[PDB]
Structure 1
Amino acid sequence: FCGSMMATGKLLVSYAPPGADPPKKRKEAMLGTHVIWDIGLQSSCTMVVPWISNTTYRQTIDDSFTEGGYISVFYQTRIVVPLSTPREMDILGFVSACNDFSVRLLRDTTHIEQKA
């Protein structure tokens, strides 16, 4: 939360395992794996997306069969600020792997090339 110290608020970070209608409203998102983040001294909040899958491994490409589900964010209450303070702020987001995480079947990537 990169907003001012005088700025309070409560957000709802959600994770919904595949198979159903991708959450478009707090109501639906609230029903799955989630964390109600309360903004204060502790600048940041971490939500763990648990290894929940049918197959022992997922494919490093877009694939209906090995789909991971939906990660969505919402306003639990609402960002509140006093006078003489900026009514708009930015929140930065970071992703990393838990100690139970692994990869296999080494392969050449598409993120770089040499046309010519």
Structure 2
Amino acid sequence: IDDSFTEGGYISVFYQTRIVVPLSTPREMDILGFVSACNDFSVRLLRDTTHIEQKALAQ
């Protein structure tokens, strides 16, 4: 959860030099980005998620 006490820091991306293209070629392009966990990774204390719900449910 977002919590200052256990904050993790900042990822940011920059132009080191610049994107350079020749004539007759597109001046704008896209980058895709991906994330995953490394094998040193683990989690604890199983819990219910907020990423789905039945609000209409009644239990």
* Residue 90 of structure 1: how far off its partner (Å): 0.2
Provide the C-alpha distance between the structure 2 equivalents of 1:62 and 1:97, rounded to a whole number of angstroms. 19
Counterpart in the other structure of 1:67? 7
Q: Per chain length, whose mean CA-contact separation is higher, i.e. which structure has more relative contact order (CA < 8 Å, sep 6+)?
A: 1
Distance, in Å, in 1 between the alignment partners of 2:40 and 2:51 is 26
Ranges in structure 2 where 5+ consecutive residues have no aligned partner: none
Question: Aligned match of 1:90 in 27, 30, 38?
Answer: 30
What secondary structure, in the 3-state scheme, does the structure 2 residue paired with 1:74 have?
Answer: coil
Give TM-score, length-normalised by structure 1.
0.47
Query: Over residues 36-88 of structure 1, what are the superposed CA-to-partner deviations in whole Å (9 max), with x where a residue is unaligned?
Result: xxxxxxxxxxxxxxxxxxxxxxxxx0000000000000000000000000000
What is the SS of the residue equivalent to 1:83? coil
| Equivalences, count | 55
**Separation of aligned partners in 2, 1:77 and 1:111:** 40
Q: Distance in 2 between matches of 1:113 and 1:96?
A: 25
Question: SS state of the match for residue 69, structure 1?
Answer: coil
Identity %: 100
Looking at secondary structure, tell me which structure has more strand per residue. Answer: 1
The separation in 2 between residues aligned to 1:86 and 1:114, in whole angstroms, is: 47
Structure 1 position 89, deviation (Å): 0.1
Match of 1:113 in 2: 53
RMSD, aligned α-carbons: 0.3
